[PDB]
RNA sequence: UGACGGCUCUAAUCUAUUAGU
DNA sequence: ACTAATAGATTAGAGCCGT
């Protein structure tokens, strides 16, 4: 008989400190953590995406009720959760004719044609942000359809990578998104049906908008304080390995700072997806310093977390370049081996947060499970747990289940319940997905709101 | 004395807006009495309150609050309240619903003026908070600690996790029996052309030039010329027991490899037994499925669950692909895998149709259906009443219990 | 690319071992 | 040293549907 360990939902904090477990919920009683004075929009799309996007904001400026209101709690309104204005009347708008979009589909050259298409809209943005008095906080780019599909090296990889260098916050919102109502595959039904899940659609576009416009939705407060949480990503270039960090951790008030630290890093060597101890110490050395410039003190622990394994020479740079009294903890986890439990009586799947502890250097944890407070499981079928193994490093396995399963609570791109997997890694390689499509890039903008 | 805000509304539908407000007023340090708040005749006691504990009556307005003769009640009541205090401020509408005219309401209330929610919640909060302060209604301090309780009590005391005890049953099938010994035999030169063990029937591989396997030396004897002659004394026998302890450390080879060649046997018996067992098999990018196939299954079920299927004009078909892992505990972890076939007889050779297929086929099963369907199918394989073999030699076999492990966990939900 | 999740198909590396160059 | 084979492992990706 196995028995399974339970790992309760850590609380993030909202307007006032005040604790929830839910941001749509938190948000929508207590209100962000950081409120902003207002959003000045930014639109770059046609006469038809200007007029849905305004109609977009005008309908999440009255509440939204979604069908199975019980399960996906409702939306209020922009102004009624935020606290902030976001007006639609209030638009920067830069037009895009759909002719000069069809001249640039006509080119034979495929990279040329998806390097035009981003250059469009960039090159408006670019000239809008020094050639408009009128300021703006985001730039919603409402594309049309025929961008998303006969362009396919990616639209949206380029497009917020080549706007790195002059740190502008954007939010593509492909207009089958917005007008998902007028957007039908020929059966008379629209093709992804948002009916029953308008509100948690409203929830997840405000989210994203109010974060790269300025505002902290809601903070984590639930994790060891003097410690780094890291994470690194490595992305393929065909033979080269780029290696990608995020770092999270409390502040001398106990406030969560999460920022990138990352730089261009590649490593040529016959194992897959490892670094040359160049490499590394540099990493290291800039999440130290970065630590360091924040808080003043050195981390009392250097929580090094990755999808893969590190080796022995790594290790060894990373200790070399670590001063003293810091711990490191180096942990693996991964999403593969299928551990699939089935509850014997009944037909909901197991809870969310149940953790099999394998030994002493190893974990199962369910990042995915069904929520009661939502009622609502976050997994259609059966939810793979994670796979939590303390590669190096000295640790107690449920401090690090309870430490991922907070790092799996801070996704600002998505309102949900909580991430499948930590955050620190998915926002590293959303990073990784972009600092790759373009050139290197020098200093890259450390913060997510240039990436996500 | 009177110092609560009643709030009024319909029982079903309004509930959304009245507990957002009722939420946020009470966060504002006022004390707020709403049924979905806070009931437990139960006409005597908002009546108390209207006649004496209430100080506000605020409507929540809709297009169905105002069918509601249960809410008329409430305006009647609080009409003459308001009489009793002369407070011609007391009803204050809370007009939510844009279809509502706002001129088609009770003469009661059609003479007083709105608090308008229609376009945007946000400034009718604002304007009720205006009203409020304007007409010098006391509120507390706003402390986030009774008002917390209240918060807990409506939605945070609803995240609690019941803490009763349940069952799971998982998709790893222990290896209940290993054989005694690990045998490292040597027909380097005895091996005719130096073959693959495709011809051996008993899983064997040549670790270095030692052909290790869980088969005595004679064992192979009709498939392997030359190697029919060979002699015993001079076979390296190492104790699984030690191995799988990871106590037998030889420079001959290490604990690691040796789990290893133990890990590929066991893969190779599954799909030689596999073989001898009635099921067709399926080619999957990165293991071997096997579908099962009309005729191998009654009514396509087995063990009440079924294992086969048709679909609208393919056939889905329960697959399943076996890896032993000893770590943790020595287990055959199992996954489940749908094929879907033409016509129950051969699978589509189109990758993207089959997968296509999966994905529409897996909305209709759920969690039970999952589980009865693996349990089902697993139990076919069983040879004896609780368990199957799976022959690792002539003589040594690897025996596997035909249920899953159970994990037992801490706690449920509702 | 509002999102999340499951799955499917490729691909390489690592390690061991033998063969050959 | 360097290629080929058989694995098992460990990681990438590309993809395609569901909600
Ligand atoms: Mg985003």
Redesign the pocket.
Known sequence: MKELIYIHEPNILFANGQKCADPRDGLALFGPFTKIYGIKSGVVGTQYGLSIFKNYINHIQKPIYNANNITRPMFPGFEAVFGCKWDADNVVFKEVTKEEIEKILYTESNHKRTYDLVSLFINKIITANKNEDEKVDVWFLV?PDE??QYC?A????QL?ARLLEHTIP?????????AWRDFKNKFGAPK???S??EG??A???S??AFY?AGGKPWKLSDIRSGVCYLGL????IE?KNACCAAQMFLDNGDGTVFKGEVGPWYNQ??????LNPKEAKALLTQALNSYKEQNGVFPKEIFIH?????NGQEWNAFQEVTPEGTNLVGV?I?????L?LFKSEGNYPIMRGNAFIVNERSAFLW??GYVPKTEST???????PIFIEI?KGEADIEQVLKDVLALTKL?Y????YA???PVTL?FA??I??ILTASTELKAPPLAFKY?? | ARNKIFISHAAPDDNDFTKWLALKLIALGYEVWCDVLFLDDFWKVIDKEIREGAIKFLLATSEIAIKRDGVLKEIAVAEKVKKQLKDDNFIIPLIIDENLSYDDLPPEIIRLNAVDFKKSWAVGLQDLLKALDDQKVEKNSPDPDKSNALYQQIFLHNKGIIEREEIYDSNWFSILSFPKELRFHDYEKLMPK?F?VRELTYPA?????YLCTFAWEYDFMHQLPKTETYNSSQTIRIPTEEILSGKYDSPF??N??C??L???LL??AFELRMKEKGVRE??????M?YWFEKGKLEKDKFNKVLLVGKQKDKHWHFGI?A?????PFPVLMI????FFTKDGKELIES??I??????????NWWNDDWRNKLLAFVKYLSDDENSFYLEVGSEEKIYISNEPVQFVGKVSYN
């Open positions: 594309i961008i998303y396919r990616q639209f949206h990889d917020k954007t939010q593509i919102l492909r207009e089958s998104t917005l992804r049906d948002f029953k899940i948690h659609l929830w997840t576009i989210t994203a790269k990503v490595y992305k393929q033979p060597e016959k194992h897959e997806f490892h990755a999808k893969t394994k590190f693996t991964t999403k593969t081996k299928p699939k990042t995915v976050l997994s259609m079928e059966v939810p793979n590669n996704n791109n998505a309102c949900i991430d499948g997997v998915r390689d959303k990784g997905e990436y996500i | 130096g693959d591989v040549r670790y270095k030039n080879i290490g690691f490899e789990q290893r133990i890990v590929q893969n190779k399926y080619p999957m990018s990165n293991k499925g692909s890896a032993g892992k000893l770590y996954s489940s895998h749908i990758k993207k089959q997968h296509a297929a999966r994905r529409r086929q897996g909305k």
